[PDB]
Amino acid sequence: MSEVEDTLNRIKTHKTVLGYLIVNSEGGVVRGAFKDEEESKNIANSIPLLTKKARSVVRDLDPTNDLVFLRIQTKLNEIMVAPDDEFSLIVIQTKG
Amino acid sequence: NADDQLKQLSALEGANGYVIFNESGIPLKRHEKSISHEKAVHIAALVSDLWNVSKKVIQRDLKTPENDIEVIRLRTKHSYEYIITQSGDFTMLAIQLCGKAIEEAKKAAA
Amino acid sequence: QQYKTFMGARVLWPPEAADDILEGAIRETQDALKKFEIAREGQKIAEHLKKYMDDHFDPYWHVFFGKNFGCQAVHNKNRFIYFYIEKTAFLMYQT
Amino acid sequence: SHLDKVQPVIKNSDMSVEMQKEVEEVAKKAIDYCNTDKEIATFIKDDFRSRYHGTWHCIVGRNFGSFVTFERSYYIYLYVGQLAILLFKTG
Amino acid sequence: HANEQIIDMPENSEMKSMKNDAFSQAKFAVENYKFENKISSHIKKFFDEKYGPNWHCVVGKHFNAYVSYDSKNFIFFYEGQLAILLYRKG
Amino acid sequence: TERVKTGDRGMSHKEGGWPGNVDPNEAQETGRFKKRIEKSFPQAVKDLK
Amino acid sequence: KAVTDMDINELRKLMIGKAIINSSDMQGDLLQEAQDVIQSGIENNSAPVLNIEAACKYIKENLDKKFGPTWQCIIGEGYAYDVTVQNNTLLFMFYNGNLAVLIFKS
Amino acid sequence: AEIMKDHQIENKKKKEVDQDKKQDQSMYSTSFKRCCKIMERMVVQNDQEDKYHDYRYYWSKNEGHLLPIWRFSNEKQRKKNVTSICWNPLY
Incomplete structure (x- = not known):
């Protein structure tokens, strides 16, 4: 298919995006498209724990209602994560 | 004056509830629609952990010195949207809906 | 019931046993325990001590050390030694 | 400044004031x-077990209650x- | 659950009365008294009454012990969690 | 062998984390402490919201 | 209808006397004894509002007399623990809704 | 899980066949597609936030003012003319 593998190529090519990284449910790197490897390795380990911890937050308040999309916003950067059961998509977009 | 903002926040389209926290964890003021003190103690424990964890992780595990988190937007099933900000020591957790859920809530009220 | 610290060991202060047999006894256990540990191979160090008592003092010594136990035993006049070391309590009495 | 903010509070402390002060920092x-x-x-648990030996049991959470038999x-x-x-x- | 005992009691010449009263007393002694020292005072006192004196018994949850005894008078059994040891000497 | 003394105590943590001087059950104690924080707080809640 | 109609607030209300076991390190027969005592125990001293202290006063004393002297039992809405225990001395069963019961023998 | 066992009425589908294939495009397909599509839009949203804040409520006596916001085009498709346009009656 062109459709997932093209959209993922499109959001990378898109201006003011550092890189898109797919995390496996077992905290593993399927695709990692950042500049420096330290950042990509760091993002691969650190962020999927925040999303699991942030999933337990929304879950406690209402255990029917599951996480569909998490967006953190830092001083310099934004961090946006779209979690699913099979895979999790992560991006880092610099604020305009 | 400091009550009028709570009245101003329910007035914004979509807004169900709000809950403010001290640096401690005590809830300062909540909405009457969201449960008072019972949920406000519960919802403090989660967000104070979620914040302090994320605050920590971005300064260490991302290896980005001097980059503190400003907002957190947990979007969910149905149309819930949990926005977490921080002004000075105090923090808070607003809950908005979307057109579909707002319309559902207005129909339920009707 | 009132314990006391003499020769780096925690003994029942009214010394039931004679103070020579007690001194030589405690010192041998401390010099046995410096070699073999109680945690690993704890059966061996008892049998070493038991045989030692029969050599230097009268025969048929009974030796009983544990982290937790409770015993009432009949013994000879001035032939009963009960001392703690760190946490482990060593009982022994001649017959 | 986060260490000044948390300000850990001790409802029930059946322990010496010196050992208590150590727990606050840990x-x-x-x-x-x-x-x-x-x-x-x-x-x-692991930090206390190293400092003072024996069999510790540690529990932490949002909402719980605790009837227990402990070394006085x-x-x-x-x-x-x-x-x-x-x-x-x-x- | 008393997986490994050591039974060195006479058994032959109707002396099973002196082995069975080890397992029987232990059970009654432990549940009632509920104090390690006081068990070793009860079991000893009984075995002295029936089979004459110079019995030594030691009751502990965790202990090491090497000892001299009179052949076919020594039994080591676990009563529940607790580990009771009794034997004759002299 | 000296059996280590076995205290028995039953404490609930269903309540949230307050100070010590303040009682979590008592409504008065909490109500004043909230009014002490809002004396400063006015600018924060405007700027936060 | 069925699972789709059932919401969390309906599921909890529909059924309070349900029972669900997570972990079970303890032996099959000894669980059957404890499970019956804790369920009957909590419901008795549930009172108008659930006294979490009161629940674990009853369970502590019951499980001291029933089995061994140093038996420790804690219940709660939510918590994290690491607890060193003897072999086949531990049951973890949570009651319906927001009640997590850990019982063990130290 | 115990309630679904109690009441087996409309047993949960979405059987774990997945995509598999080991390597060279593993799954990357239908729940994950939604997450990719949502991510794209939300990445755009952040870069066009200035225009999106205007679009909703910029609020622009016998005078009118027209503001162009966004242009949707394609560089391959610059030869062709727009001709007819229409809106979906539902959305």
Whole structure:
């Protein structure tokens, strides 16, 4: 298919995006498209724990209602994560 | 004056509830629609952990010195949207809906 | 019931046993325990001590050390030694 | 300045004032070091077991309650924000 | 659950009365008295009454012990969690 | 052998984390402490919201 | 209808006397004894509002007399623990809704 | 899980066949597609936030003012003319 593998190529090519990284449910790197490897390795380990911890937050308040999309916003950067059961998509977009 | 903002926040389209926290964890003021003190103690424990964890992780595990988190937007099933900000020591957790859920809530009220 | 610290060991202060047999006894256990540990191979160090008592003092010594136990035993006049070391309590009495 | 903000509070402390003061620092150090609640419990036990020997049991969470049999003068119950660090040694 | 005992009692010449009263007393002694020292005072006192004196018994949850005894008078059994040891000497 | 003394105590942590001087059950104690924080707080809640 | 109609607030209300076991390190026969005592125990001293202290006063004393002297039991809405226990001395069963019961023998 | 066992009425589908294939496009397909599509839009949203804040409520006596916001085009498709346009009656 062109459709997932093209959209993922499109959001990378898109201006003011550092890189898109797919995390496996077992905290593993399927695709990692950042500049420096330290950042990509760091993002691969650190962020999927925040999303699991942030999933337990929304879950406690209402255990029917599951996480569909998490967006953190830092001083310099934004961090946006779209979690699913099979895979999790992560991006880092610099604020305009 | 400091009550009028709570009245101003329910007035914004979509807004169900709000809950403010001290640096401690005590809830300062909540909405009457969201449960008072019972949920406000519960919802403090989660967000104070979620914040302090994320605050920590971005300064260490991302290896980005001097980059503190400003907002957190947990979007969910149905149309819930949990926005977490921080002004000075105090923090808070607003809950908005979307057109579909707002319309559902207005129909339920009707 | 009132314990006391003499020769780096925690003994029942009214010394039931004679103070020579007690001194030589405690010192041998401390010099046995410096070699073999109680945690690993704890059966061996008892049998070493038991045989030692029969050599230097009268025969048929009974030796009983544990982290937790409770015993009432009949013994000879001035032939009963009960001392703690760190946490482990060593009982022994001649017959 | 986060160490001044948390300000850990001690409801019930059946322990000496010196050993209590040590728990406050470890309790603060545990939370700012750890990424989740399960890790907090693990760090406290392991740190105390090293300092003072024996069989500790550590529990921490949002909402719980605790009837327990403990070594007298080895039980503290401190809550910090919404986390109750409860540690107790048994024989 | 008393997986490994050591039974060195006479058994032959109707002396099973002196082995069975080890397992029987232990059970009654432990549940009632509930104090390690006081068990070793009860079991000893009984075995002295029936089979004459110079019995030594030691009751502990965790202990090491090497000892001299009179052949076919020594039994080592676990009563529940607790580990009771009794034997004759002299 | 000296059996280590076995205290038995039963404490609930269903309540949230307050100070010590303040009682979590008592409504008065909490109500005043909230009014002490809002004396400063006015600018924060405007700027936060 | 069925699972789709059932919401969390309906599921909890529909059924309070349900029972669900997570972990079970303890032996099959000894669980059957404890499970019956804790369920009957909590419901008795549930009172108008659930006294979490009161629940674990009853369970502590019951499980001291029933089995061994140093038996430790804690219940709660939510918590994290690591607890050193003897072999086949531990049951973890949570009651319906927001009640997590850990019982063990130290 | 115990309630679904109690009441087996409309047993949960979405059987775990997945995509598999080991390597060279593993799954990357239908729940994950939604997450990719949502991510794209939300990445755009952040870069066009200035225009999106205007679009909703910029609020632009016998005078009118027309503001062009966005242009949707394609560089391959610059030869062709727009001709007819229409809106979906539902959305």
